[model samples]
Target: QDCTFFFPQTEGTVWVRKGYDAKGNLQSVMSYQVDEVETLPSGQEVEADYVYTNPSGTIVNKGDIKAYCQNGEFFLDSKETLSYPGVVSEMNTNVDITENFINYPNPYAANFDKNNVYFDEASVKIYDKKNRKNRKDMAIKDREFIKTESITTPAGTFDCAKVKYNIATRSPKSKETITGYGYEWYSPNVGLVRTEQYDKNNVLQSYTVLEELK
Candidate 1:
C-alpha cells in the first residue's frame, strides 16, 4: 500500500513523494516546509505554498494529528509528541460579559440576517476562550440586542456582548433573556478550531469539530 506523510503548511518549496500499492494505485502527494518569516499584523507568516495530490488522490487519516503553538514554538499535533521549543501558558484574568439578542439557525430567516439577530433578555458570560455560560433571566423585556464590539487579543477576536430589550408583562414569564452563550479557542497560527455554547438553561446547544493537525 502507498503510505507517507508530509506537511502542508509551509512556504516556497513543495515536498512530494511517490509510491505504489498492491492494488496498483499510483500514489503521489506533495508537502511543504514552513519557515518563520515576518509578515503584516505582527504574527508569523504562513507563506503561500501548496503541494499537489497524488494522481490517484491519496486519503490521509489525520484523526490523531494536533496543531498548537506555545510561546513562539510551532509544531504538528500527533500522538507521542513531547513538547515544543518555546511556549508558555497565558492566563486570562479578565471576565467578558455580554448579551445575545438572536440565536443562530433562526426559524424565520433563511440566511443569516443581522437585524434578526437579537435576544429579548439574557446575561452572557464567557470564561477564557472555551467555557461559556448564558443566563436568560436577565434579558431585557422586548427590545433588540446588539453585539457592539469584540474582545480583541493577540490570539484572536471574540464577539463581546452588547444587547437591549423591552420590558413587558408577558415578556418576563414567556420571554427568554439569555438566549445563548458560547466561547471559541483560537491561536495566532490557526483560526478558530474548537467551540462550546450553552442555552438559557445552562445546557449545551452545539459543538463544532476539534480538528487535529497532521
Candidate 2:
C-alpha cells in the first residue's frame, strides 16, 4: 500500500494530452503536473498545476489545485482548497463510516456506491481583497466497478480497473441540469491513466490520457 503518488512522485511526472475535434485536427494541448508536495498536520498534501494551451502553446484556462493526499486513498481527491482561477472551493467525500483521506484508489479495490459517496463541497468567491460564501453542495453519486482492461497512453499501456462515474453539479443560478458521465481508468502502478467524459446527448465531450508516464 505504499505506492503513494497520484502522478508519480518522481518529480515532473507530467502528461501532455491533445484534445481533438470530431473532424480531428489538433484543437488544444493540456499539460498536467504534480508541482509540489507538502506535509500537513493531518497528512501529506499534493499541489497540482494544470495548464491548458492551444496547439501553439498559448495558455488558456489554468488550474492551481491543492489536493489532499496520503497512502491508500482513492484518487487525488479530498479537501481541495482551490481548483481553478476563480473557484476557491473545498470538498470531502466519504464512502463509509470511517473516512478515507488517503490517495490513489485507496488500495485499489473494486466497489459499488450510491449512497456510497457522500460528497460535500463548499465554495466561495474572491472578487476583491476578501471572499464571500454562498455556494455549498452535497451530492451522492452512483458508482460501479467495471471489468479490468488494458488501456494505452503516450506513457504506455497498463492494466487498470475501469469505473463508471456519474455526477451532477448545479448552482442556484441555473435552472438547467449540468451533469457528467463516463469511465475512469486507474492503475495501481500509474494512478489515473484515462478518463472519458460525455454530454447530455451521450456524445463524447472530452477525454484526458496519460501522454507521458516516466
Candidate 3:
C-alpha cells in the first residue's frame, strides 16, 4: 500500500536519461529531480524539475511537473509522459492545453502479472496561442502491460515492468496525424528508467535509457 515502492518520494532524488536515435547516435539528454514532496489526503504528491538538452549539451526545455499517488493509483501529467526524442522537440513549443493526464498501471493489484493487460487513455487539446484554429488533439490509447524482467542501465540493474502503447496526435484543420508505438520500463521505487519508440512498421526510431541515478 506504499506508493513509495514504485517511485521515490524523497526530495533531491534525481534520474537522468540519455536519448539516442535508431543508429545509436546520441540525440538528447534529460533529467528529472524531485524538488518537493507533499503529503496528500490519500497518498502523496511530488513536484520535480526537469530539463531537456540537445546532443551538444545545450538546454532546450526546462520546467517543473507534478505527479500524484493516491490510494495506490499513480497519475502523471502530459509533459512527464514518453515520446520520441525528435518529435518531442517539435511539440515543446508554447501552447494552451485543454486536458492532460494518464493513469499508471497498478503494481499492487492482486491479479497483476505477465500478459495481464491494462488499458490507459489520456487526451489533450493543444491550441497554438497565436492561432486558435491551428489546434491539435493528442491521445494515448491501447496501453497494455507486457511483462516483468530484469534490466541493467548505467544507474544499476533493476526489475522492471514493461508496457507498450500507441500515441496519436491529429490536427483537424490540416488533417494531419502523427502516430507511433512506444514501450516504457518502470522499476520499483525508481519510476521510468527507459523508453523506446517505433514507427508504424515496427522499425526502431528513437529511445532513451537511464544513465544516472542520484
Candidate 4:
C-alpha cells in the first residue's frame, strides 16, 4: 500500500473590523475567520476552520481553535464538522539527500558563521522527541549556537540539539524577504533529524524530518 498525506489546498480572506480605544489613538481592527481546505492522503478532501486575528490591532476576543480528520470527515475541536468524500490520494514516497552540519561537543555554545547558516537572526523550537507538544521556543537576536540535551523517544533514548538562523530584512527589496532558519539535531543514533526555514514574510521555505514526533 502507498502512503499519503493531506496538504492545504486553499486559504480564506483576511477578515477585518473597526473599533476605537480609550487612548484616543486609532485602535481597533479585527479579523475573526480564516478557512482552509485539505486533501487527505487517502484522497479525501477536508476543510479546516481557524480563527483569525490581528493581535496588535483590535480587542476582539479569540478563542482556542483546533482541527483534525477522521474516518474521512473533518472536525473542529470535537465540535463543528464537514464532509469529504472519496479515497484520499496516496502521498509521494520520494527522499532527497542533503548536507548535514554539526555543532560539536554536545550542548556546546558557539557562534555560527555565515557558512553554517544563511540568516542573521532566528529562533529555535525544541520538541520532546517523544511528545512533540512538549516543546520550547528560544529566540536568537543576532547569533548562532546549538543547545544540546537528552531526549527520550518511543524507539529509545538519545541526545539532541536545536539550531536556528534568522534574517529579519533584505536589501534591494525583492517581492518578498527571507526570515528564519532552524534545525533539530539528534545523535548518530538518530541523525540530523529535522530542519526548517522561513522567509522574513514567515513563508516556509522548507521542512525536512526523519520521523513524526506525534
Candidate 5:
C-alpha cells in the first residue's frame, strides 16, 4: 500500500529538470523534492516542494506538490492546483482553489493496467486584486494511459507511461474560453521524466525533460 515505487515519498529525495521551447532553446530549470510524508486517516499523504528558475538561475516560481496513496491507489495533485499558489503570489491575483482534485490510479502503480483510460477533473477560480470584478475559471481534465515506452534523458534511460490531458480556461467576465493539451511521461520510481505541451492544432508548444536524479 505504498507509492514509493511510482513517486518518491522519502524526504530529501530531489530531482532537477530543464524546460525548453519548441525550438530547443533553454527556457527554465525546475527542481523538485519530497518534503514530508504523513499517515492520514484516508491514506498516506506526501508533500513536496517544486521550484522553477529562469535559465539564468533566477527563481520565477515556487510551490508545493501534494499526493496521496490510499488502498494501494495513488492520486496526484492537479497541475492547476499546484501552480495557483505561485501565480497568486507572483501575479498579485487572488486564486480560489475550487476543486482540490487528484488524478488517481497512477499509471506507474504496479496494478494499474494500460488498457484503460481514466479521467479526472479539477477547477480553480481567479480574481484580480486591483479589479474585483475581473474573474476567471480554469479547469483541467486529465485522461491517462495512452501508451508506454522507453525514454532517455540526461538523467538516464527509463521505461515510462505516456499520459495525455487537456486544460480549459474561461473568463467569466469576458465570456471567453481557451483550451490546450499536453503529454507527460512518468517512470517507475523516477516520476515525471518528460512533458510536451501542444496547442489546439496539435503543434508542439514546449517541452521539459529530466536532467538529473538523486
Candidate 6:
C-alpha cells in the first residue's frame, strides 16, 4: 500500500523536512525513516524512526517507534480532525503521559476558509530512555487558507495548499517558530513543499523550499 505513515513506500525511503533561513542558509533537517514493516494476522502496521539533524551533524536521535497508522490511512489528510468553539471530536490532551501519546494529525487536508479562523492541537511525550515521562505541547491557531495553486520551489514545482497559521510546538518540530505569522504550502502525500515566515509589518523573514527528493 502507498499509504505508509510518512513515506509512500520502500524501507530505505526517507522523508526529510529541511529548514533554511530567508538568506537561503541551512537551519536544520528532520528525517523520518521506515524502520520496519510487519503484517498482522488480522491487519497491518507501520513502524518508523525519526531523527533531528542540525545544520552540521548534530543528530537528535529517538531510537524507537513513536507512531502508528492503523488501517493504513493517514490522518494528516483528514479535515474532520479539527475543533471549533464548543464543538470538538478529539481529546483535550493538554497533559498526557508517555505510555499513550497522541501525535497530532497533520493539517495537510484540513478544511480552513480563507480569511477565517480555526485551530487544532496535539501533544507528545519526550521519550528519553531514562526520562520518558517528560511532555511538550503544541498548537496551530489563527488560520487562513489562502488557496490551492501551482508553486515552484527548489525541490520542484508543486500544486500546494497554501495556509497561514500560528504555531507553538510539534513532536518532530516541523521548522518551528514561536513568534511571527507562519505561512506554508503543503502538498498531499508529501508534507511541506514550502515554508515562509513574516513579521507583523508584513516583512519577509525566512523560508525554505523542497530542494532534494528521491
**Candidate 4 total steric clashes:** 14
Maximum-TM-score candidate: 3
The runs of at least 3 residues in candidate 2 whose Cα sits more than 4 Å from the true structure, single-residue gaps closed, are: 1-4, 22-25, 38-44, 67-71, 78-140, 169-174
lDDT of 4 by residue, 1-214 (tens): 1211112233452322222222323222223233554545643332433322223632223332333344432222211100000000010112111112112222332442434543233333423344454433334344354666665543345456565544333323245443454344435312334344455566554443332221
lDDT: which is higher, 3 or 4? 3
Give the range where candidate 6 is weakest over 10 consecutive residues by summed lDDT: 80-89
User: Could you estimate the TM-score for every candidate?
Assistant: 0.23, 0.62, 0.86, 0.27, 0.79, 0.55
Report the lDDT tens digits of candidate 5 across residue range 5-62.
3566778889887777788988777788989978876567778888777777777666
What's the lDDT for all of these models? Answer: 0.30, 0.50, 0.75, 0.33, 0.68, 0.48
Q: lDDT of candidate 2?
A: 0.50
Please give, for residues 68-122, the per-residue lDDT of candidate 1 as tens digits: 2223333332111100000001112222224242221221224536566543233
| Per-residue lDDT of candidate 3, residues 1-214 (tens digit) | 5654356668999988888999988887887899999997898888888888777777766767777888877777764555347555554445455646577675546766656655658777767667778777777788888777888998999888888888787877655687888898888667777889887889988988888998
Candidate 4: C-alpha lDDT: 0.33
The RMSD (Cα, Å) of candidate 4 is: 19.0
Better of 3 and 6 by lDDT: 3
Ranking of models by lDDT: 3, 5, 2, 6, 4, 1
Q: What is the lDDT of residue 125 in candidate 5?
A: 62
**What ordering of candidates by TM-score runs from best to worst?**
3, 5, 2, 6, 4, 1
The clash number for model 5 is 0
What's the CA RMSD for each of the models?
21.5, 7.7, 2.5, 19.0, 3.8, 9.6
- Give the higher-TM-score candidate: 4 or 5: 5
Candidate 3 positional error at 182, Å: 0.8
Which ranges in model 5 have alpha carbons more than 4 Å from their true place?
A: 2-5, 39-43, 80-99, 104-115, 126-136, 172-175
lDDT of 6 by residue, 1-214 (tens): 4333432334555666566656766666656666666655433445555554566756534333433455534333211111111011112223222333222223343453354434333332333344434434434455566777787765677667776765443444345534446676766544567777665567666665565555
Q: Is candidate 2 or candidate 5 better by TM-score?
A: 5
